[PDB]
Every structure is written in C-alpha cells, then in structure tokens.
Design a binder for this molecule. Sequence first.
Ligand SMILES: [Cl-]
Ligand SMILES: [Cl-]
Ligand SMILES: [Zn+2]
Ligand SMILES: [Zn+2]
Ligand SMILES: [Zn+2]
Ligand SMILES: [Zn+2]
Lengths: 312, 320
Amino acid sequence: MEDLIPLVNRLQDAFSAIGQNADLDLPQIAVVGGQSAGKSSVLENFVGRDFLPTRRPLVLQLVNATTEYAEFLHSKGKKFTDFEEVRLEIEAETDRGISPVPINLRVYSPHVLNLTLVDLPGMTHVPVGDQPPDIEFQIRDMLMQFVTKENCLILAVSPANSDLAHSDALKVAKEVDPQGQRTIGVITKLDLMDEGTDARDVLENKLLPLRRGYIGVVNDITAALAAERKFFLSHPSYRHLADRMGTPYLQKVLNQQLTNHIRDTLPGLRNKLQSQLLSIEKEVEESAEQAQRRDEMLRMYHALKEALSIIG
Amino acid sequence: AMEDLIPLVNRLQDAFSAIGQNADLDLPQIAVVGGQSAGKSSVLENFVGRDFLPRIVTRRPLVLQLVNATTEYAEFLHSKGKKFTDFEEVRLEIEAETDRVTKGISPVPINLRVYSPHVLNLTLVDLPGMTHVPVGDQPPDIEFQIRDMLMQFVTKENCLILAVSPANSDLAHSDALKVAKEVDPQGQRTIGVITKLDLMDEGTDARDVLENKLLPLRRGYIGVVNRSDITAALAAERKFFLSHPSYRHLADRMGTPYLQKVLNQQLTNHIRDTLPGLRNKLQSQLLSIEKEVEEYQAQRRDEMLRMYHALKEALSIIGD
Ligand SMILES: [Cl-]
Ligand SMILES: [Cl-]
Ligand SMILES: [Zn+2]
Ligand SMILES: [Zn+2]
Ligand SMILES: [Zn+2]
Ligand SMILES: [Zn+2]
C-alpha cells in the first residue's frame, strides 16, 4: 500500500477546499514545537530546499515522483519550481491573528518519500510586531484543535540543548497524550549542547519514555545531510545509535508509522464520515447568518461526498 | 563607594549564619538565580578560577564571599580555623555540611570565604538551581521546595537578583526571569546574565537582549561564554566577543571580568544606599524581640535568645 498516504492526501484536499481539517479526525502527523525548537529546519531538510517564512496549518504532502515541483490546492493548476515564491505564497495565502483553516502544499520529488505532515505554528510567549497580547493562547488553542483528536499522531520537536521539562511540544503532548501512545519525539540541536553533556538518556527512551521512540537530528542539503551522518558516527555517546538517528532515518520511520496508522484507522474514519453524512442528510429536509449556515452545510455535503469517493 | 562595605556585610552574614539565619533579615546582597541548565555554576566557577560546586547542584544557600589574594584557598564558617587548599575537598565539604542538616531543601546558609587572584571583592548568595522533575532520591515536591526557598530570599526588598539565563533557548523559558518578573515586575533590582552565547543556532544572536531592548532591566544584561585553565578560558571569551559581528560594539561591556567588576560596583553602591534603612529595620526587630525575650519549648526559647544577640551584634557592626 503505496496508495494509503496519497489516499489521505486526497481526503485532506477535499476538506481543505471547504476550509476544514481538524474537526474530521483524519489520520495524520501534526508537527508541534516551540518557536526555537528547530521545527522549520526538520521540515526543510525533508524537502531539501528552504521554503518556510506561520499563522495557519501547513498540510505538507511530500509525494515520491520522477518530476520535481510544488502545487498549492488553493491555486490548483499552477506548478511551482521556485521555492522562494512558495515561501511568498504561504505568507500571501495566510494574509488571505491565528486560523485553523489549512494551507495544502503538495511537493512532488524523487528525493522525498511518501509522507504528509501538518505543520502547526511555532509556540511563542511574548507578542512581537502587530501580534495581539494573547498570541501565546491563540497559537496553543489552535494547536489543541488538531492534537486533541485521537487519529492525530504528534511529532513533538524539542531542543537537546535545553531542559526537556521546558519543551513546549512535550508539555502539549503530555496534556493530550499522557500515556505517550501517539507521540513521536524529535530531538534537535545535539551539536549545540554544553561540553561534557549529552542526550543519551533521552535518545535511548529511558528518561521520558514514548512508545513510538525518539529520533535525534542536527541542522546545500547534500552537504548538510553528510555533516549530520558524520556527527552521529563521530560522537561517542551516539555511535551505537547512529543508524536510528538523522533526517533520512526520521523520514523513513514517519513514512512507516503513518502508513501503518492510516491502515489501522481509515475504516473507522469511513464509519465516522458515514455517521456525519446520515446526520447532515436529515438536516437538509433568509438572513446573512442563515444563508451562511446553509452554504456551509452544502460545502460540507460536497466534501463528504468527494471524500467517500476517495475511500471507496 | 567604599571598599569596606562588602566586608561589613560579610560580617553581618557570618553573625546571622552562626544562628542559621539570612533571608529573614533583609541584608543587602546579590542572590544568584537560575534554572538547572542555565549555566549558573560555570559563571561562579569562572570568577573563582577553580571547579568547586556540585555537578539543583546544591540544596542550601551558599554565601560565597570572594576575597582577592595571591593564593587559592577556602574557609568555611562552620569549620573554624581549617584552610581548604584542595577545591575537590571544598565540593565534598559543601555536600557533607548539606547532609548534616538535610533529601530536600533548607534555607540555612553555608558561608564560604574563597581566596583567589581571579576574584574581586564580591559576595554572592548562590541559591539551588531550579528543577521540574525529581531525579535520584529527591522528594516528589522538589520543584516547589526549591522555588519556595528561592522566594524567601528574592521577595526581600534589599535582595538584588542575579538572573542567569541561557542565550540558546527562548528567553521566555528562563526560570530566573520568571522568578524575577514575579517579585520585581518593574525590573529595578534584577541584573541579567546571558550565558551560552557561543552555543546559539547558526545565523542567530542575542543582540536585542544584550542591548536591553527585548525584556528591559534598569541594571542591564551582561553576556558570558564558558569556553574552558581560567586564563585560557577568559582569553577565549574575550576573543569571542571581539570577533563576533553582532557583539563587537558591546565587547567591553561583556564577559566575566566585566561582570565581576559591575557586580562589585552595584553591590557596593547598593550596600551604601540601604545600610541606613537596614539599621532602622534591625533596630525595630531588636525592640520587638526584646519584648519577647524580656523574661530571659526550650529549643524555641534558645532560638529567640540567639536572634536577640545576633541583632545586637549586627547593629554594633553597622554603627552610626
Ligand atoms: Cl521548546
Ligand atoms: Cl533556565
Ligand atoms: Zn516556548
Ligand atoms: Zn459537490
Ligand atoms: Zn527550568
Ligand atoms: Zn509575641
């Protein structure tokens, strides 16, 4: 089943066309991190190009393919070769506070595996620029709409070179998933720890256990990936773990865990979407509010019908 | 701004430490506050030029009384006469004296005179590193025990707060600044130390913090680096600040020699300003405890008499 991740990408597109994602409990990986956790670099190392500026969710659909381009759902036909204009388009579509309405970005490339990640805004604490006083709360509350849903896997990104108790990602993950059953740990910045310290206890799954494990990473992609591989092979604390460390390994294990997760939950999703259809089918058998309520219901009907056709 | 003011307060600290007291007397002093991974120990050890702290390093306050001298040695108040030349035995004695009282936290100070050519005339009250999860055989409420004990010091108006934060994490995560913001929301008695400037991400810097723009403090922020042989470490730090393009213009108000100088100056000035106010408060405390003591559990009565005598001793040290 090379088609399972693509199948769910089509489900994501169907619901993103009507500005929906979080409420439908789709099987997906949400990427969670504090603003200084190194989340952006993890995603850019998967793509192998710099493309991030965020105030909305980015449904980043990496597709294995012979040809290399990017495609936004909201401008359906336009093929993107320049990832500098991909960055500009993310900013542009965002300006179209915080919103849970997803931006869907499909990247085709032979350097990527079949993998989809829902990147959520970095957690912050102090307002900067024209952000409101409660920006911390707005971001955290929007994150919660995604990560409270049972089919959401949490990619919890934490820096190695700070106390793990300070991790914004793990504070969120502990709240919604206290048993650590759907949280995958990413440990960044292992090259920027203090002299005579290491994160071996975390990376060996001993300090704060997660069922799905911890993967270490370090941030011209070919040179960057080469330097990462060389770091893990050279470092005496991480020599023995080296073949389950780094961004290629991380990308591989997420492909495997997402594929298996979609396999487990997609039949349950069909049932839940069917119950939603039966409920909304009863509802269908005028102010600006009342018209807007009718239009939203019809858009939802269309997305559900499109989605059920994808599942088959 | 007299050179005898820090020594005067050292005598006050010794008088009250002899009866197991410090925090409740509101002495003019610098409390050193930091999260367990903020680099607080390295800041103090780079002043001294020797490794001597545990490696919540400590479970009691350390009244570190630094004295400029030709030789390197230490003297504990509790162990009168005994000179410590081995700083490895200094680390052991801190731990040993801690276990003599305490596996939780106590506010009862350990007074340590450190003689070294690497130090200026300076006293610092080092408080336990803040932690969030108990490790080893530390009790379940260790986070609360540390934070509550810290508060007994830093809520007092004459306490200057030396807030140690790492540069290579979000400044909003600083345990030190969270504490300082609570007790000193206007930032009038908080001195910022920014550590680990050499371990930040590529293409980032802490210039906005170090220029006092991001989270303003009246008394300023000082950047340091531990690239550790103290002479070689200090040389490498000086070279870092001079070389780095974000910090070139600030270089002469950065680093450990500068930090040590500015703390000497700020403490001396602070002792001068508050000493008349301290006399009045200690006099009121004496008059109050004299009414309690006027008929001169037994151990509870002993503590009241000890405090009475310490106040008289302290007022005599301050004079007129
Ligand atoms: Cl974080
Ligand atoms: Cl901290
Ligand atoms: Zn944060
Ligand atoms: Zn339709
Ligand atoms: Zn902390
Ligand atoms: Zn009374």
